[PDB]
Subunit: 86 residues, 2 copies
Amino acid sequence: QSREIADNTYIVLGTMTLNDFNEYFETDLESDNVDTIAGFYLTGVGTIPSQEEKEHFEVESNGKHLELINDKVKDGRVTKLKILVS
Amino acid sequence: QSREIADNTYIVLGTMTLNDFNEYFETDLESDNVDTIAGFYLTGVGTIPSQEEKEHFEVESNGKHLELINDKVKDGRVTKLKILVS
């Protein structure tokens, strides 16, 4: 569900569960009525981004700073995210 | 995919395709990179709504005025919409 593409830089599938995300990244992200990393990102930014109009969401968890950015969007779904760690 | 619940008032599944929606409602809704009515609504409002913080989107098509409102949201997906016609 997650692939390292450069140092501290990853592509994750939007459908990756928050529990799997948290296990991989050693974080503790959570949000009400959210199950997946796309859900967490979308509820955090509050907007359907696009490639032209990317949306960045920054959070801190377990001493890691994460920057989440849309990498692919389909029918209003963020299907891939770029994750940059600290 | 669509159910009449009161006069000129409908509940539609978010996964209803725009082509099926348009056939049912006699409209011509379209948007780039969108396939379903949820995709159209979400790209139009630009925000993940919630039940507490509903989002309304109004459009005109083929002489019909449509008001689209979230009825159910799951993991950032609008899964059901209320549609009010003219």
